[PDB]
């Protein structure tokens, strides 16, 4: 069903994340983790603490299509294990949990329009480009169901 995700999702804070290529978001979604430039972090960071939860949607440049999203589970932090992100600065790690690894090409969100951006379409926007509510919220319930994730265990972070 969809009513865990709607819980979920319950005054979010939403953020596109742009990748420059298939590699990182592999490595994001293999080890449940993302970094980004300082300029992000520190929006990140500071969503992080604002909202019950913090969502990511990723979007690989030139892809046509996003990959799937993330809830934030952590601050940036850094140390920890290297990650060898295919780079084309990334300072801290946030930790992540997926709440859909499954893509949806932009052809399908062609009628959401993102109010913080101009009220252009949404697949438009910087990395770190803010999503407002509403339209974060449609997005991401246009994805295909993900039935590989149970999100009680997110529902318990929260
Ligand atoms: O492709 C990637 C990977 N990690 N951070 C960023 S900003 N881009
Ligand atoms: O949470 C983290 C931080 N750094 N590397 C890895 S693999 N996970």
Not at 80 to 102: A, E, N, Q, T, Y
Not at 124 to 141: A, V
């Amino acid at each position: 069903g969809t009513s865990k995700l709607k819980y979920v999702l319950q005054d979010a804070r939403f953020f596109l994340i742009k990748s420059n290529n298939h590699e990182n978001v592999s490595l994001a979604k293999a080890k449940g983790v993302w970094s980004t430039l300082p300029v992000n972090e520190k929006k990140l960071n500071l969503a992080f603490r604002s909202a019950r939860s913090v969502i990511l949607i990723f979007s690989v440049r030139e892809s046509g299509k996003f990959q799937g999203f993330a809830r934030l589970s952590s601050e940036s932090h850094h140390g920890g294990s290297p990650i060898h992100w295919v780079l084309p600065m990334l300072g801290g790690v946030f930790k992540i949990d997926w709440i859909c690894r499954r893509e949806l090409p932009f052809t399908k969100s062609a009628h959401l329009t993102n109010p913080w951006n101009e009220h252009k379409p949404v697949k438009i926007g910087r990395d770190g480009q803010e999503i407002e509510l509403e339209c974060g919220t449609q997005l991401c319930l246009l994805f295909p169901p993900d039935e590989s994730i149970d999100l009680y265990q997110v529902i318990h972070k929260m």
